[PDB]
Structures are given as C-alpha cells and as structure tokens.
Amino acid sequence: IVGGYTCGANTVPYQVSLNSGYHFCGGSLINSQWVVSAAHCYKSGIQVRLGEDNINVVEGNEQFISASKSIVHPSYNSNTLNNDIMLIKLKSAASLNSRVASISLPTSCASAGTQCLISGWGNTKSSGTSYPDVLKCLKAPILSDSSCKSAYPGQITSNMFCAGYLEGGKDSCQGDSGGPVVCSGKLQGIVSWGSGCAQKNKPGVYTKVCNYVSWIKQTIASN
Numbered sequence: 001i002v003g004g005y006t007c008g009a010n011t012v013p014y015q016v017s018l019n020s021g022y023h024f025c026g027g028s029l030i031n032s033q034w035v036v037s038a039a040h041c042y043k044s045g046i047q048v049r050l051g052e053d054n055i056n057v058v059e060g061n062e063q064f065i066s067a068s069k070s071i072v073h074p075s076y077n078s079n080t081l082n083n084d085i086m087l088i089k090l091k092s093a094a095s096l097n098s099r100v101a102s103i104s105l106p107t108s109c110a111s112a113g114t115q116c117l118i119s120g121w122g123n124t125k126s127s128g129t130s131y132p133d134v135l136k137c138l139k140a141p142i143l144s145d146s147s148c149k150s151a152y153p154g155q156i157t158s159n160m161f162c163a164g165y166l167e168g169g170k171d172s173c174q175g176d177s178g179g180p181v182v183c184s185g186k187l188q189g190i191v192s193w194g195s196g197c198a199q200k201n202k203p204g205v206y207t208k209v210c211n212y213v214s215w216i217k218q219t220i221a222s223n
C-alpha cells in the first residue's frame with residue numbers, strides 16, 4: 001500500500017497473509033474454512049496466516065492453517081488477468097473471534113463513488129522498494145467505468161473495476177495482490193493489477209467480486 005496509514009493490529013480481521021516460506025499475497029476469509037484470493041497468486045504449498053499484524057513477529061492472535069485445496073477460476077486468463085480470482089480451502093476451520101472474522105459476500109455490485117477500504121503488506125513506495133511488517137490500510141473510491149477504461153484502453157473487462165485516485169499518490173502495490181477491497185461491510189474486490197503503483201492516470205484494477213458470488217457459493221457447497 002502506497003500512501004496509506006497503519007491499520008492497527010487486528011482491525012481488519014478478515015485480512016489474511018498467504019505464506020510459502022514468506023508472504024507473497026493477501027486474501028480474505030469468507031467463512032471458517034474458505035479464503036478468496038487472486039488467481040495470479042496461485043502456487044502449491046500455501047499456508048494461510050490469519051490474525052496477523054506484524055508478519056515477522058509472533059504477537060499472540062495468529063492462526064496458521066495449511067491449504068488442502070486451491071481452485072482457480074475456470075476461465076482465468078493469465079495474459080489479461082480476466083477472472084483473477086481463486087478459492088482456497090483450509091485443512092481445518094479457523095476459530096472465529098473478535099480478531100479473526102469472516103467478511104460477507106455482496107448481494108449487490110457496488111457503484112462508482114462508493115468509498116472502500118483496501119489493505120495489505122505490499123510495497124509502500126512508488127519509486128523503489130520498502131516492504132512493511134505491519135498491515136497498511138487505504139480508503140479509496142471506486143472510479144466510474146468510463147474513467148477506468150479511459151486510463152487503460154482495451155484492457156478493462158466486465159469483471160474488473162478501478163479504485164483509487166487519478167492524481168496518484170495512493171494505491172495498492174506489489175505484495176497486496178489477492179487482498180480485500182471492502183465497501184459497506186461487503187467484499188467487493190480483489191487486488192489484481194495496475195501499471196506500476198500510485199502513478200497518475202494509472203489507478204488500481206480490482207477483480208469485481210459481485211460477478212462471482214454464485215460460483216463461490218456452489219463451489220463451496222460441493223468441496
């Protein structure tokens with residue numbers, strides 16, 4: 001997260017870290033046994049880390065659970081990142097509390113102008129690299145579809161939306177991928193891609209979770 005603020009330990013209880021020896025992506029706990037992330041985050045040997053603030057320090061509220069199954073969306077295209085969404089089942093159900101909580105899926109697609117919260121452990125710089133240990137948070141509006149397609153000619157699909165600021169300075173970034181975009185208490189997006197980070201006229205592009213609710217629900221019900 002570039003240009004954000006420190007969230008506070010466990011203030012974002014649905015945020016998760018995907019770990020394969022090291023943090024490489026974020027995710028969202030949507031029930032006690034399932035996590036949503038970005039398909040381009042796929043790899044084998046994932047351990048899901050719930051309850052994290054400093055991902056380099058055991059602080060007391062962590063739950064470390066291995067994945068038993070990863071399900072990339074059937075129509076994921078790694079060239080275009082269309083349908084950048086993946087489901088992860090935990091080997092064991094998490095223990096849900098104040099600090100480890102699921103986030104609800106949407107009944108409705110959120111509209112442009114809605115303010116949302118983005119979070120993750122990604123790069124905090126637009127030029128160069130400095131990765132934080134504690135969770136970073138960004139409030140940002142969904143941008144209209146027209147602005148989004150204007151900034152990214154020929155690249156936005158019905159399954160993506162832009163959020164952020166055309167002026168630059170505030171954005172998600174590398175290492176935030178897979179993480180949550182929450183609007184009015186609902187998971188509306190997944191950190192997916194962008195042209196650099198926090199550049200002007202290059203806002204962040206997010207998977208549009210409101211299109212995948214039925215796939216998520218019938219996938220969870222059969223696995």
Ligand SMILES: [Ca+2]
Pocket residue numbers: 052053054055056057058059062
């Ligand atoms: Ca920790």
